[model samples]
Target: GSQITGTCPSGCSGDCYPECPPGCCGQVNLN
Candidate 1:
């Protein structure tokens, strides 16, 4: 199991919190 959470940045910035279930762990960048 895993948890994911995030929010878009303020003014022209981007953000993300993508999660890969099924036992996959990786980072995702939301530009």
Candidate 2:
């Protein structure tokens, strides 16, 4: 399966959300 790299999105700027794609700023869920 494919995975999310959490690269900076073109749209939505500033603070991001879980509903939206992860951003380079932060969004990684590690164990």
Candidate 3:
């Protein structure tokens, strides 16, 4: 199984966007 984690820039609640590791946006499915 695959998983991702990230944080928002403005400290926004919930998962951000753009996925994790690269940008602090949100979570996305890899498979």
- By TM-score, who's the top model here? 2
- Tell how far residue 3 is off in model 1, in angstroms: 24
Candidate 3: residue pairs that collide = 16-25, 16-26, 17-25, 17-26
lDDT of 3 by residue, 1-31 (tens): 2343333443332444444334454334344
- Descending-lDDT candidate ranking: 2, 3, 1
Q: How accurate is candidate 1 locally (lDDT)?
A: 0.32
Winner on lDDT between 1 and 2 is 2
lDDT for position 14 in model 2 = 45
- Candidate 3 Cα deviation (angstroms), residue 24: 0.4
lDDT of 3 at 1: 29
Q: What TM-score against the true fold does each predicted structure earn?
A: 0.13, 0.21, 0.14
Ten residues in sequence with the least summed lDDT for candidate 3: 4-13
Model 3: lDDT to the true structure: 0.39
Error of 2 at 30 (Å): 29
Scanning candidate 1 in windows of ten residues, the lowest lDDT window is: 8-17
State in Å the error of residue 20, model 1: 1.0
TM-score for model 3?
0.14
Look at candidate 2 and tell me the lDDT of residue 9: 57
